Amino acid sequence: VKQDMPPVGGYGPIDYKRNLPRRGLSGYSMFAVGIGALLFGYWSMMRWNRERRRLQIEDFEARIALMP
């Protein structure tokens, strides 16, 4: 009998592919998302700014009527 170490029954395949799935989407979608979220933030910032303008005018009314 012989007791070397051959490949017992053959070994299966071994990959060597450059498998890069390319996660993400196209860049035009990235520009669309960026400009959309940016403009969303601009509109919300505009609304909050003019609300605080209203309250700032009310504080001006306080300092005007409080003075004499």
Add this chain to the structure above:
Amino acid sequence: PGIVELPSLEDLKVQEVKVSSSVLKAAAHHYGAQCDKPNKEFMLCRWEEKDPRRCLE
């Protein structure tokens, strides 16, 4: 040159409205609405004649 004419302490003693300032701010809008009608006369007296000791009444 010339002497100053500063008025008397017996005319310069009126009881203040000795409230604190935060409540004075908190009641300011209705203080400007109903009252503060004859003090634009006071403020016009001040801006026309720029002499405190002249418009103190």
